[PDB]
DNA sequence: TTTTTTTTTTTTTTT
């Protein structure tokens, strides 16, 4: 075992044997740029440092001599071979081994050991693993000759990935397994990081694993540094090793040796060991010890082997490196100086391969051409492989390229492409070949195969074979090869960056330079975009230091600003002077501004060269180092060679390529054609148009079709979107009869059609409506919810690959329409993207951003989309120029409109005010008349058009047709024969295409729709507010569809459809299919299967917002499934549109409104389920409730407005206003009436409505009920109305339906369960089951007699309104019926004892005080899912604080984090609620939206989410008092029904809430009995059936209480009379799933997460003294509740702070700790003391910010260490930002949210003092008001006088809020200054009022004994006798508590 | 024998 150094110690160490074994084989493999070759050379260096001879086989053809030298290699003494064939390569190894003259041979890249046969055969064939069997034969031979020569052989090898293997790692080596075995060492080298000189990248942090070892232990690893231009940091390691082995001292940053300090920092420990090699050896050796006639026989057999190899293989087969002339680093200009500088070697190396990759439009091709220009500027010949089929000749010229002298190939196949490269290299006639897009090097097999055939990485193995071949022919031809490549992302990767190149890793390695070009910004002429600010990174470099970057400008139509750079570089290097704006050279002023420094160096090229060169000298760390008739002889022999192999025009000069020409078509928009620069869309290229839904994508598309068919070209349309209107297409000037149209099933199909249409060359222009609808086969056949991640994309990238070629050689223009989608979570630039991956982006020769920017108005009517289109990609002319115009609906682009404007701006048309003139002659007054005259004179229009074009374009235009229709109808029939009958046909004769429309159930709507209804086979979205009428309208189109014998399906994803109501809307309940799906996936898969059956005519989906993804449901509430919803929608749309159109099944989606937070443009209204829907929808509907329809008192109708916000069917934006009567629906005939009136079809003489003379009814109400009565007349009127106002009029059978219906039924049932889908009429879980509210009039107003089971109910209202109360009362009357209730006291303010006084079973009531809102809801979820709870209630959604918010600080902006939590919760809950028949009540608080000037600024918390899902929304309010004369005993209360899905809404309920009793149920009963004549009222007496029941309502109350028999009897008959929606082994299955859910919740969230109320110990009403007895008395509960929040407010000087301190005193008197937040900055310590406060023990904060203030509260609560915190003045809780507009409030509301929880579980009482600002209010918004369990109105009412001196504030304190006892009781006492509350003072008064103390005038007596004359003396005596005081105190307490 | 290609929003906030 003889070992050589590796040149890396840690490596030698990891090797175990101290190096690489002699006579053995070693493989080093690793990534491109890893350091394979480097390491190699370093073992060579340290072998030549020991007098051993090395040979190098640069099979890679990429060894840098000069570098080799910088690595310590003896260049002059190193043998070097650049062998042609691998065989050669190895035979050399063999002969060098056999000589025994070489000690170490290395082979740079076995991957480049190309077999003979492979090189002399083509690129593409099957010589498969010929490489390997060569390796295995070589190994076989070599090992023997190696050991008996003790010759060490190193193989460098590359990494390759074998497709589709998922065992461990798909990393492999080249040259088969052969090597692997024979190797005695295998080495995994890698670059792991950077070594940085701060800015400069100077080193490859490198790791090398021993993956095979026959020499010592394997797998030991070695980590070190490879400094570029030096090699391995040997001493670097030495250092570390010395450190680890205690040979070098490290005291912090200082490194010592034997006591003597060697350097501070590792960088200085390095440079000292370098300086002292004596010491280094000494350390090196001791480290090693610790961790591990002779030479003239050589040179005689050396030179005999030399000559042997030379004699077999040719002249310079092998030679010394130092004297290799073909080896030299020859560099070409890039056309960018800073680039040449960053390259280090001044350019791109000749004979090597260079890859340039970067984004679409980056400048890849551009840069390419610029190196071509500057190569042709030096008399070198260039070849171009436009595999991309998108090189602009004319542009090439503008870049300085010699078009006439530049070779150009547009190859069909990639193989072809490369074989051309090969033959051009082999000729040595081309100096530089470039390949535009390896990504377009489509393999033969792929082109001939279909789109969708998996040729997985066939591309790659082609590349790896090509590289193999090319590098050799490149170096011996000194031919530089540039590859342009595209960016693609590898899906699912979580490391580093998912950016990659095409054509596999192959390229990466072989490349001697790899270039990351990018567009980083704009270069602006102010308005015009003229330049791509561009950055190019050197990502691979074999030539000099990598990673140096180059930043410059690419001016369009000029190229790289070469001199631009020169300038800057001159500036930075002090070669050019810059004094402000002036640029000087050698004193002489060259230009003011960089723009003038540019144009002067351009003007003086003598000076430029002089500067260029000196710059180069200064910044290049790798400087440059019968003749031409031998070229053109082998040029034209290769030319003809390529021509003879591949066809006529396989290759030719650019200047004379006729298929190349930039031929352009009109867009149908002039300004667009102008912005395009080239006057239109390029033929044979691909164009992408993307933009918003309704933008005009499809429209524009058709308009280029029109103007193409206007020039006799044939167009094909791929309506992948399944939403093209034939009739409309016609109105756009399209030849419907002559336009090919495909509605393909699969995207593959779609594209294969494109392919076959291109290949025929018969179509001139194909357009594809929505790549976003190019659904892959696998996706359609698979389910919705199957992850086919970017299957779409790899389909696109394969399609592009194929199409571009067939497009250019067919001059067929391909337009792709695409949609916008957002990439979630991105914080840079704009989150706008396209579908179908980046693929498209690159291939496109034009990319178009169309948008709707405004309206075009005929005053009232919306008639036009003011439209803007940006050129975002341009390969044709200058990009980014924009085009603004008008799209009139039913006409298209106002072409002439533009013409006009353009004529105006260019002085071709005269404008004198309003008159437009041409050549003097007046053409029209107003633009509208300038329009209609140019329309009338097309001769003049052309004349103007052309001259405009001449003036504003910067790239002007430059047996035949029976060959088309012969290959047309052969392709037609081809497509028809592959894919079916009507796969493709002329538009004009498509019967499935027809715009078939259904009634909406609203005429004015059908009218506004323009086409008389909703289109069949299309998707319609209806969105709008909660209660708007979405579901309603839905059902009404269902009714009028079932009225025409069509079958409807309903997806009640919302879980809130009323069967009974559905019926009242005219829906056939028995015949209506209904699904309440669990998951959205389910929901959609149902849609899919219903569409696919073609058995349903119309499916509707109630709330996409409720299409909860599987993962979301199974996951928790609070798990971020960000837009998982969306990608589900976008997959669903993709699938559905196809199955919808071929089933003519109309799909309606109902969706909800949500706001996007933080947006300052337009309107923050949006839809759920992402943009997906928006596009696919053929109609989008904005429904709204705008007003009331009133029967005087009763609210009976939703005055309703519906906007058409999207329309693919007719003109959009027309609006429809009508009435939705509850329990009847839309008043269809209502409209009919109005419409008849407006159109003079019905007569109106005042109030009388007449028809044809005959009087039909007085009043609209009577015109209604008569048309209802005569449907004959109604139809007759309906139709004539329609004729008059529609600018888009209407245009064995059924046993095939019910056969595929019941097969789909059973299909859905079999996939998803029993009652997944069924007829409405027989759904038992659907039934409207109602619970009592505990308030009759409420149950009455509800219409359905109570709250619906399985639904969600929101009750909102003011603080103290009675929200919680009402809640409990429905709980009581639910537990009174044996139902189980759960309570989520998120508010942390439910009184157990009170709950009891309300009739609630405390012992049987589940109660949760959850920490987080997530928790809160997850509890709801688990309680619903158990089905064990019948009714859950949540006290304050406003207290459902999100985790993040709780853990985050108060003042952290979690903007509407609350909401997205709610919307996720709703999503989840409604389903689990209905299938558990569990009623969920949410209590919520009122908040105001600031700055709103409409209606009412009242809102709810937790976003709109709740609002929609709720089946009932309840506005409770306190309206007045119920008085026992003096005492306030009752909250006179009013509750509005603000949402109702259950019966008629808006009916109101007024009643009484007695405190300590609850709702006076019977109270209502009484009134109701009175109003309904069931109870007699003769004045004050109330009678029943004659018998007198009580005088006064108070006595009518207490008698019904006493006779519950009579009460039920009255109750029921009342109910019968006023409800317009009447009511419709068992319990041991409950308590079994109850206690399993109990334990479930307990096990997830902790011990006392949930428990019975009666046994909650943290719940207890624990009270503290206020320091004022009468106050404690008025409080009712004897003080302030612990764990709750209390607000005390009152006037300045009132005594707020005082009182505060007094509760503190009496808390510290009971050994509790108090904290004070003197936010007011005005607490007197000394005074605090005089009030009995322990100053030394009282915590005090004077916080700067309110946030601070609260965060302190939070942390004090959370510690549970403070018992009572007080905050002096919320009014002084100034928000941070306000030091640095109700910012105050949203801070309060966030604080409350957080605090209440931490307060109750800490039993920490929080007092807030607040100020006053009846117009009396508090600061810090309503937030406080609600959360407070007590609110206190303190006031100073008078003086307490010592005669003269004022000594006391006579003080009054009202209880204005109380959750603890009866409110409103008041407390009057004295606050003596310097003493505080006169405790005994009160005692006195109280004693007086309660007859415990005698008062005979002025004398106060106790038990007869006289205690003092005057209250002042009754005071000072009780002070003196505390025994007596306690005795009185206690008896008072007994009496009044 | 040698990769293949993205995927799609998310939800108010509070005198
Ligand atoms: N024919 C042309 N006329 C004017 N500008 C062009 C032309 N072709 C491309 N450009 C512009 O030059 C820049 C780089 O183009 P290019 O190098 O073709 O992109 P890629 O890197 O995708 O090959 C882009 O901003 C593009 O808009
Ligand atoms: N523990 C209690 N004892 C007596 N009365 C109470 C108690 N809690 C609340 N009240 C009274 O009942 C009415 C409604 O209280 P509540 O429903 O808690 O208000 P909210 O609607 O804010 O939840 C109020 O007038 C209040 O003063
Ligand atoms: N530093 C002080 N020394 C003596 N008396 C004070 C002091 N501060 C306040 N007072 C008196 O105590 C009473 C209540 O003060 P305070 O509670 O601060 O009023 P507010 O209710 O506005 O906070 C007032 O009559 C005031 O004059
Ligand atoms: F074509 Al669209 F929304 F994608 F109308
Ligand atoms: F004394 Al003040 F609010 F007026 F604390
Ligand atoms: Mg190398
Ligand atoms: Mg290009
Ligand atoms: Mg469209
Ligand atoms: Mg609804
Ligand atoms: Mg409450």
Whole-number Å distance, alpha carbon A522 to ligand 6 midpoint, is: 37
Paired tokens of A1120 = 């971020």
Give residues whose Cβ lies within 5 Å of ion ligand 9: A 1031
Find out whether A1870 and A1886 touch, Cβ atoms under 8 Å.
no
Whether A1851 and A1707 map to the same domain: the answer is yes
Distance CA A1831, CA A1825 (A): 7
Q: Is A1358 annotated as a binding residue?
A: yes
Which residue has the least CA–C1' distance to nucleotide B6?
A: A790
Q: Is A668 annotated as a binding residue?
A: no
Last residue of a domain, one of A1826, A1844, A1877: A1877
The burial class, CB within 10 Å (0-12 / 13-18 / 19+), for A126 is exposed
Q: Give, in degrees to the nearest 5, the angle at Cα A783 between A780 and A789.
A: 75
Last residue of a domain, one of A1198, A1227, A1256: A1227
Q: CB under 6 Å to ligand 1: residues?
A: A 358, 360-366, 392, 395, 532, 554, 556-557, 842, 874-879
User: Angle, to 10 degrees, between the axis of helix A605-619 and the axis of helix A594-601?
Assistant: 110
CA distances for A967 relative to A451, A453, A973, A1634, angstroms: 20, 24, 10, 73
Residue A1270 in domain: no
Whether A1869 and A1885 map to the same domain: the answer is no
CA distances for A716 relative to A743, A994, A1745, angstroms: 11, 18, 67
Q: Is residue A465 classed as helix, strand or coil in its secondary structure?
A: helix
Residue A521 in domain: yes
CA distances for A1551 relative to A363, A582, A972, A1193, angstroms: 76, 85, 77, 18
The burial class, CB within 10 Å (0-12 / 13-18 / 19+), for A439 is buried
Find out whether A1539 and A1545 touch, Cβ atoms under 8 Å.
yes
Residue A926 in domain: no
How big is chain A by its Cα radius of gyration, in Å? 44
Check residues 791 to 830 of chain A and report those whose beta carbon is under 7 Å from nucleic acid strand B: 792-794, 796-798, 821-826
Ligand 4 binding pocket mutation candidate from A693, A703, A818, A1172 (most atoms within 8 A of CB)? A693
Distance CA A480, CA A864 (A): 55
Work out how many domains chain A is built from and give that number.
9
Distance CA A1885, CA A656 (A): 115
Residue A623 in domain: no
Query: Mind giving me the DSSP string for A821-845?
Result: EEPTT--SS--EEESSHHHHHHHEE
**Largest separation between any pair of C-alpha atoms in chain A:** 145
Phi, psi of A1880, deg, nearest 5: -70, -30
Q: Give, in degrees to the nearest 5, the angle at Cα A742 between A741 and A748.
A: 150
Residue A253 in domain: yes
Using alpha carbons, select from A1508, A1550, A1557 the residue that is nearest to residue A1530. Answer: A1557
Distance CA A678, CA A273 (A): 66
CB-side exposure of A285: number of CA atoms within 13 Å?
6
Whether A377 and A239 map to the same domain: the answer is no
Which residue has the least CA–C1' distance to nucleotide B9?
A: A1123
Residue A819 CA, closest ligand 4 atom number: 4
Q: Is A1769 annotated as a binding residue?
A: no
Task: Say yes or no: CB of residue A1727 within 6 Å of ligand 3.
Answer: yes
Q: What is the resolution of this structure in A?
A: 4.2
| Separation of A723 CA and B15 C1' (Å) | 49
Query: What CATH number did the domain enclosing A1158 receive?
Result: 3.40.50.300
CA distances for A968 relative to A753, A761, A764, A976, A1683, angstroms: 12, 8, 11, 12, 83
Distance CA A312, CA A1532 (A): 113
Distance CA A288, CA A1498 (A): 80
Task: Pick out the nucleotide with least CA–C1' distance to A824.
Answer: B9
Q: For ligand 5, atom 4, name the residue with the nearest CA.
A: A1692
Whether A1737 and A1806 map to the same domain: the answer is yes
Task: Say yes or no: CB of residue A1698 within 6 Å of ligand 3.
Answer: yes
Q: For ligand 4, atom 5, name the residue with the nearest CA.
A: A694
Task: Pick out the nucleotide with least CA–C1' distance to A135.
Answer: B1
| Separation of A763 CA and B8 C1' (Å) | 34
Which residue has the least CA–C1' distance to nucleotide B2?
A: A461
Find out whether A238 and A272 touch, Cβ atoms under 8 Å.
no
Phi, psi of A500, deg, nearest 5: -145, 175
Number of helices and strands in chain A (H, E): 65, 99
Residue A1266 in domain: no
Task: Pick out the nucleotide with least CA–C1' distance to A1156.
Answer: B11
Whether A351 and A481 map to the same domain: the answer is yes
Contacts of A951 (CB under 8 A, 6+ apart): A906
Phi, psi of A1907, deg, nearest 5: -95, -25
| Separation of A475 CA and B5 C1' (Å) | 33
Contacts of A1679 (CB under 8 A, 6+ apart): A1663, A1664, A1665, A1666, A1672, A1703
Whole-number Å distance, alpha carbon A1698 to ligand 3 midpoint, is: 6
Find out whether A1064 and A1039 touch, Cβ atoms under 8 Å.
no
Distance CA A1473, CA A1478 (A): 5
Paired tokens of A1518 = 């306190």
Distance CA A868, CA A875 (A): 20
Whether A1638 and A1603 map to the same domain: the answer is no
Residue A1836 CA, closest ligand 3 atom number: 25
Q: Which ligand is nearest to the CA of A1206?
A: 4
Using alpha carbons, select from A404, A332, A342 the residue that is nearest to residue A368. Answer: A332
DSSP state of A1104: G
Distance CA A726, CA A584 (A): 67
Which residue has the least CA–C1' distance to nucleotide B1?
A: A129
Distance CA A203, CA A1318 (A): 70
Question: Within A697-765, where are the H helices?
Answer: 697-709, 726-731, 747-760
Task: Pick out the nucleotide with least CA–C1' distance to A794.
Answer: B5
Paired tokens of A1065 = 């809307």
Distance CA A354, CA A1300 (A): 60
Strand pairing class (A407-409; A254-257): unpaired
Using alpha carbons, select from A385, A369, A459 the residue that is nearest to residue A417. Answer: A385
Q: For ligand 5, atom 2, name the residue with the nearest CA.
A: A1692
**Residues, chain A, total?**
1937
Distance CA A901, CA A922 (A): 16
Paired tokens of A106 = 């290395």
Distance CA A117, CA A1070 (A): 77
Paired tokens of A848 = 């178009």
Whether A1634 and A1703 map to the same domain: the answer is no
Q: Is A360 annotated as a binding residue?
A: yes
Boundaries of domain holding A245: 234-292
| Separation of A1805 CA and B15 C1' (Å) | 26
Long-range contacts of A128-137 (CB under 8 A, 24+ apart): A129/A176, A131/A86, A131/A174, A131/A175, A131/A176, A131/A468, A132/A175, A132/A176, A132/A177, A132/A178, A133/A176, A134/A86, A134/A87, A134/A90, A134/A175, A135/A110, A135/A175, A135/A176, A135/A178, A135/A179, A136/A176, A136/A178
Name the β-bridge partners of A1900. A1895, A1908
Residue A1792 in domain: yes
Whether A1002 and A1084 map to the same domain: the answer is yes
Q: Is A649 annotated as a binding residue?
A: no
Whether A402 and A524 map to the same domain: the answer is yes
Ligand 1 binding pocket mutation candidate from A358, A363, A364 (most atoms within 8 A of CB)? A363
Find out whether A1672 and A1870 touch, Cβ atoms under 8 Å.
no
Q: For ligand 4, atom 1, name the residue with the nearest CA.
A: A698
Check residues 829 to 858 of chain A and report those whose beta carbon is under 7 Å from nucleic acid strand B: 831, 833, 835-839
Check residues 1768 to 1787 of chain A and report those whose beta carbon is under 7 Å from nucleic acid strand B: 1782, 1784-1786
Q: How many Å from the N-terminal Cα to the C-terminal Cα in chain A?
A: 100
Strand B close to A1484 by CB, under 7 A: no
Whether A47 and A180 map to the same domain: the answer is yes
Find out whether A209 and A187 touch, Cβ atoms under 8 Å.
yes
Contacts of A961 (CB under 8 A, 6+ apart): none
Q: Is A31 annotated as a binding residue?
A: yes
Ligand 2 binding pocket mutation candidate from A1359, A1365, A1678 (most atoms within 8 A of CB)? A1365
Q: Is A173 annotated as a binding residue?
A: no
Strand B close to A457 by CB, under 7 A: yes
Strand B close to A1156 by CB, under 7 A: yes
Last residue of a domain, one of A561, A589, A624: A561
Distance CA A1809, CA A1769 (A): 5
Q: For ligand 4, atom 4, name the residue with the nearest CA.
A: A1175
Q: Is A1922 annotated as a binding residue?
A: no
Distance CA A4, CA A292 (A): 14
Residue A1599, H or E segment: helix A1593-1600
Residue A1488, number of CB atoms within 10 A of its CB: 14
Distance CA A1537, CA A1515 (A): 6
Whether A135 and A214 map to the same domain: the answer is yes
Residue A517 CA, closest ligand 1 atom number: 21
Which bases of chain B are under 7 A from a protein CB atom? 1-15
Whether A249 and A371 map to the same domain: the answer is no
Paired tokens of A1498 = 């009242």
Task: Pick out the nucleotide with least CA–C1' distance to A498.
Answer: B6
Find out whether A731 and A892 touch, Cβ atoms under 8 Å.
yes
E strands in A1259-1325: 1317-1319
| Separation of A887 CA and B12 C1' (Å) | 35
| Separation of A1784 CA and B15 C1' (Å) | 9
Q: Which ligand is nearest to the CA of A1101?
A: 9
Residue A1733 in domain: yes
Q: Is residue A398 classed as helix, strand or coil in its secondary structure?
A: helix
Query: What CATH number did the domain enclosing A1595 receive?
Result: 3.30.250.10
CA distances for A948 relative to A869, A904, A953, angstroms: 19, 10, 8
Torsion of CA A82, A87, A93, A98, to 10 degrees: -140
Using alpha carbons, select from A1535, A1163, A1048 the residue that is nearest to residue A1335. Answer: A1535
Q: Is residue A1765 classed as helix, strand or coil in its secondary structure?
A: strand
């Amino acid at each position: 075992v003889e070992t050589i150094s590796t040149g890396s110690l840690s490596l030698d160490i990891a090797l175990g044997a101290g190096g690489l074994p002699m006579g053995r084989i070693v493989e080093i493999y690793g990534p491109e740029s890893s350091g394979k070759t480097t390491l190699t050379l370093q073992v060579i260096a340290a072998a030549q440092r020991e007098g051993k001879t090395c040979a190098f086989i640069d099979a890679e053809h990429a060894l840098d001599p000069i570098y080799a030298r910088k690595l310590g290699v003896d260049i002059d003494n190193l043998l070097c071979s650049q062998p042609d064939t691998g065989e050669q390569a190895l035979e050399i190894c063999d002969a060098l081994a056999r000589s025994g003259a070489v000690d170490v041979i290395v082979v740079d890249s076995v991957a480049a050991l190309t077999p003979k046969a492979e090189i002399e055969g083509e690129i593409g064939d099957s010589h498969m693993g010929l490489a390997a069997r060569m390796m295995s034969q070589a190994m076989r031979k070599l090992a023997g000759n190696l050991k008996q020569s003790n010759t060490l052989l190193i193989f460098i090898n590359q990494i390759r990935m074998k497709i589709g293997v998922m065992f461990g790692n798909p990393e492999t080596t080249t040259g088969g397994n052969a090597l692997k075995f024979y190797a005695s060492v295998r080495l995994d080298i890698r670059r792991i990081g950077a070594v940085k000189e701060g800015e400069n990248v100077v080193g490859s942090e490198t790791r090398v694993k021993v993956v095979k070892n026959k020499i010592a232990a394997p797998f030991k690893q070695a980590e070190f540094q490879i400094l570029y231009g030096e090699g391995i940091n040997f001493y670097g390691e030495l250092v570390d090793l010395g450190v680890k082995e205690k040979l070098i001292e490290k005291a912090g940053a200082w490194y010592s040796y034997k006591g003597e300090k060697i350097g501070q920092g590792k960088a200085n420990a390095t440079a000292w060991l370098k300086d002292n090699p004596e010491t280094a050896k000494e350390i090196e050796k001791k480290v090693r010890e610790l961790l591990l006639a002779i030479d003239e026989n050589k040179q005689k057999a050396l030179a005999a082997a030399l000559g042997q190899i030379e004699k077999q293989f040719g002249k310079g087969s092998i030679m010394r490196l130092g004297e290799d002339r073909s080896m030299d680093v020859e560099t070409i200009s890039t056309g960018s100086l800073s680039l040449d500088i960053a390259l280090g070697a001044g350019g791109l190396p000749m004979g090597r391969i260079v890859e340039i990759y970067g984004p679409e439009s980056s400048g890849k091709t551009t840069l390419t051409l610029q190196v071509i220009a500057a190569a042709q500027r030096e008399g070198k010949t260039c070849a171009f492989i436009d595999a991309e089929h998108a090189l602009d000749p004319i542009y090439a010229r503008k870049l300085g390229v010699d078009i006439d002298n530049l070779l150009c190939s547009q190859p069909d196949t990639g193989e072809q492409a490369l074989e051309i490269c090969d033959a051009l290299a082999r000729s040595g006639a081309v100096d530089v070949i470039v390949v535009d897009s390896v990504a377009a090097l489509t393999p033969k097999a792929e082109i001939e195969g279909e789109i969708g055939d998996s040729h997985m990485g066939l591309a790659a193995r082609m590349m790896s074979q090509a590289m193999r071949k090319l590098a050799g022919n490149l170096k011996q031809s000194n031919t530089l090869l540039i590859f342009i490549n595209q960016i693609r992302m590898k899906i699912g990767v979580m490391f580093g960056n998912p950016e990659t190149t095409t054509g596999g890793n192959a390229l990466k390695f072989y490349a001697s330079v790899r270039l990351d070009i990018r567009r980083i910004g704009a270069v602006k002429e102010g308005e015009n975009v003229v330049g791509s600010e561009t950055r190019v990174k050197v990502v691979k470099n074999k030539i000099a230091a990598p990673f140096k970057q180059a930043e410059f400008q690419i001016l369009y139509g000029e190229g790289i600003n070469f001199y631009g750079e020169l300038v800057d570089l001159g500036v930075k290097e002090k070669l050019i002077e810059k004094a402000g704006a002036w640029y000087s050279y050698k004193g002489e002023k060259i230009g003011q501004g960089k723009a003038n420094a540019t144009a002067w160096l351009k003007d003086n090229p003598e000076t430029a060269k002089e500067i260029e060169k000196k710059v180069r000298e200064l910044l290049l760390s790798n400087p440059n180092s019968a003749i031409d008739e031998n070229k053109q002889k082998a040029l034209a022999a290769a030319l003809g060679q390529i021509e003879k192999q591949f066809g006529k025009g396989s290759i030719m000069r650019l200047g004379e390529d006729r298929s190349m020409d930039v031929e352009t078509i009109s867009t149908g928009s002039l300004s667009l054609d102008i912005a395009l620069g080239a006057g239109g869309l390029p033929m044979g290229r691909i164009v992408e148009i993307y933009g918003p839904e309704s933008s005009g994508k499809t429209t524009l598309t058709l308009q280029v079709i029109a103007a193409a068919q206007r020039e006799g070209k044939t167009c094909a349309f791929i309506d992948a979107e399944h939403a093209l209107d034939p009739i409309y297409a016609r109105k756009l000037g399209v030849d419907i009869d002559n336009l090919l149209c495909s509605q393909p099933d699969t995207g593959e199909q779609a594209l294969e059609i494109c392919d076959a249409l291109a290949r025929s060359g018969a179509v001139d222009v194909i357009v594809v409506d929505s790549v976003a609808a190019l659904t892959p086969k696998a996706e359609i056949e698979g389910e919705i919810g199957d992850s086919h991640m970017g299957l779409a994309a790899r389909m696109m990238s394969q399609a592009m690959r194929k199409l571009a070629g067939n497009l250019k050689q067919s001059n067929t223009l391909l337009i792709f329409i695409n949609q916008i989608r957002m990439k979630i979570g991105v914080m840079f630039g704009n989150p706008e993207t396209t579908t179908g991956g980046n693929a498209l982006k690159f291939y496109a020769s034009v990319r178009l951003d169309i948008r709707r920017i405004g309206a075009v108005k005929e005053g009232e009517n919306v008639v036009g989309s003011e439209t803007r289109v940006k050129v975002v990609k341009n390969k044709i002319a200058a990009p980014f120029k924009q085009a603004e115009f008008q799209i009139l609906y039913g006409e298209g682009i106002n072409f002439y409109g533009e013409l006009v404007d353009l004529g105006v701006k260019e002085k071709l048309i005269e404008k004198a005010g309003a008159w437009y003139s041409y050549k003097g002659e007046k053409i029209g007054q107003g633009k509208a008349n300038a329009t209609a005259w140019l329309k009338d004179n097309p001769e003049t229009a052309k004349e103007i058009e052309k001259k405009v074009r001449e003036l504003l374009l910067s790239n002007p235009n430059s047996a035949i047709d029976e060959n088309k229709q012969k290959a047309l109808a052969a392709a037609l029939g081809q497509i028809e024969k592959q894919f079916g009958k009507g796969s493709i046909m002329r538009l004009g004769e498509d019967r499935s295409m027809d715009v078939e429309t259904i009634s909406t159930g609203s005429l004015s709507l059908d009218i506004a729709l323009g086409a008389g209804g909703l289109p069949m086979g299309r998707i319609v979205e209806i969105y709008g507010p909660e209660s708007s009428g979405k579901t309603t309208l839905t059902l009404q189109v269902i009714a009028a569809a079932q009225r025409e014998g069509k079958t409807c399906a309903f997806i009640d994803a919302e879980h809130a459809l009323d069967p009974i109501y559905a019926r009242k809307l005219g829906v056939d309940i028995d015949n209506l299919l209904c699904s309440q799906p669990d998951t959205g996936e389910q929901a959609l898969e149902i849609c899919d299967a219903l569409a696919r059956s073609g058995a349903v005519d119309v499916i509707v989906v109630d709330s996409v917002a409720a299409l909860t993804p599987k993962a979301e449901i199974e996951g928790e509430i609070g798990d971020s499934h960000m837009g998982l919803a969306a990608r589900m929608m976008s997959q669903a749309m993709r699938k559905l549109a196809g199955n919808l159109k071929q089933s003519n099944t109309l799909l309606i989606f109902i969706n909800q409104i949500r706001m996007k937070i933080g947006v300052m443009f337009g309107n923050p209204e949006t839809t759920t389920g992402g943009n997906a829907l928006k596009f696919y929808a053929s109609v989008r509907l904005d429904i709204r409730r705008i007003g009331a329809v009133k029967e005087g008192e009763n609210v009976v109708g939703s005055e309703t407005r519906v906007k058409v916000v999207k329309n693919k069917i007719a003109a959009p934006f027309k609006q429809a206003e009508f009435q939705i009567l509850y329990g009847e629906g839309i008043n269809f005939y209502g409209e009919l009436v109005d419409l008849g009136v407006k159109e003079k079809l019905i007569e109106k003489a005042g109030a009388w409505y007449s028809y044809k003379g005959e009087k039909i009814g007085q009043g609209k109400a009577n015109a209604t009920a008569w048309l209802k009565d005569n449907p004959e007349t109604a139809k007759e009127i309906e139709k004539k109305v329609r004729e008059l106002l529609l600018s888009n009029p209407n245009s064995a059978i059924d046993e095939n339906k019910q056969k595929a219906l019941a097969a789909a039924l059973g299909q859905i049932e079999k996939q998803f369960g029993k009652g997944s889908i069924m007829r409405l009429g027989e759904d038992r879980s659907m039934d409207v089951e109602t619970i009592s509210t505990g308030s009759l009039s409420l149950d009455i107003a509800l219409g359905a007699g109570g709250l619906p089971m399985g639904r969600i109910v929101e009750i909102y209202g003011p603080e103290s309104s009675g929200k919680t109360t009402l809640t409990l009362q429905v709980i009581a009357a639910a537990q009174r019926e044996g139902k189980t209730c759960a309570f989520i006291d998120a508010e942390h303010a439910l009184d157990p004892i009170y709950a009891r006084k309300l009739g609630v079973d405390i012992d049987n009531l589940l109660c949760s005080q959850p920490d987080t809102g997530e928790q809160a809801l997850e509890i709801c979820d688990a309680l619903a899912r158990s089905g064990a709870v019948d009714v859950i209630v949540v006290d304050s959604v406003a207290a459902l604080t999100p985790k993040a918010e709780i853990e985050g600080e108060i003042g952290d902006s979690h903007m509407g984090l609350a909401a997205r939590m709610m919307s996720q919760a709703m999503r989840k809950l409604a389903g689990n609620l209905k299938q558990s028949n569990t009623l969920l009540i949410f209590i919520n608080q009122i908040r105001m939206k600031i700055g709103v000037m409409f209606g009412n600024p009242e809102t709810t918390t937790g976003g709109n989410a709740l609002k929609f899902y709720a089946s009932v929304r309840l506005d409770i309010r306190r309206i007045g008092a119920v008085k026992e004369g003096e005492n306030v005993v009752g909250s006179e209360t009013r509750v509005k029904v603000v949402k109702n899905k259950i019966a008629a809404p808006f009916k109101q309920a007024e009643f009484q809430i007695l405190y300590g009793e609850g709702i006076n149920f019977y109270g209502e009963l009484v009134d109701l009995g009175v109003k309904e004549k069931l109870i007699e009222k003769a004045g004050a007496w109330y009678s029943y059936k004659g018998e007198k029941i009580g005088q006064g309502k108070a006595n009518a109350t207490a008698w019904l209480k006493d006779n519950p028999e009579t009460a039920k009897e009255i109750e029921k008959k009342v109910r019968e009379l006023l409800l317009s929606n009447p009511n419709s082994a068992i319990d041991e299955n409950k308590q079994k799933a109850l206690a399993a859910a109990l334990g479930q919740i307990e096990k997830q969230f902790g011990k006392g997460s949930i428990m019975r109320l009666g046994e909650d110990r943290s719940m207890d009403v624990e009270t503290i003294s206020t320091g004022s007895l009468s106050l404690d008395i008025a409080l009712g509960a004897g003080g302030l509740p612990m764990g709750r929040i209390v607000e005390i407010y009152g006037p300045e000087s009132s005594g707020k702070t005082t009182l505060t301190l007094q509760v503190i005193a009496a808390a510290q008197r009971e050994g509790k700790t108090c904290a004070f937040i003197d936010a007011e900055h005005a607490l007197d310590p000394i005074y605090a003391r005089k009030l009995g406060v322990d100053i030394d023990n009282l915590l005090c904060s004077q916080p700067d910010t309110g946030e601070q203030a609260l965060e302190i509260c939070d942390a004090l609560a959370r510690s549970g260490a403070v018992d009572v915190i007080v905050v002096d003045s919320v009014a002084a809780l100034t928000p941070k930002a306000e030091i640095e507009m109700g910012l105050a409030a949203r801070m309060m509301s966030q604080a409350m949210r957080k605090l209440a929880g931490n307060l109750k579980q800490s039993n920490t009482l929080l007092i807030f003092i607040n100020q006053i600002r009846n117009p009396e209010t508090t600061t810090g918004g309503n937030a406080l008001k609600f959360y407070a369990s007590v609110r206190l109105d303190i006031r100073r009412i008078g003086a307490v006088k010592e005669g003269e001196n004022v000594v006391g504030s006579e003080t009054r304190v009202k209880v204005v809020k109380n959750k603890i006892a009866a409110p409103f009781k008041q407390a009057e006492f004295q606050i003596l200054y310097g003493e505080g509350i006169n405790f005994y003072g009160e005692l006195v008064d109280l004693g007086v009022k309660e007859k415990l103390i005698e008062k005979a005038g002025a004398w106060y007596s106790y038990k007869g004994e006289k205690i003092g004359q005057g209250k002042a003396n009754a005071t000072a005596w009780l002070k003196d006798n505390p025994e007596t005081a306690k005795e009185i105190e206690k008896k008072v307490r007994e009496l009044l508590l």
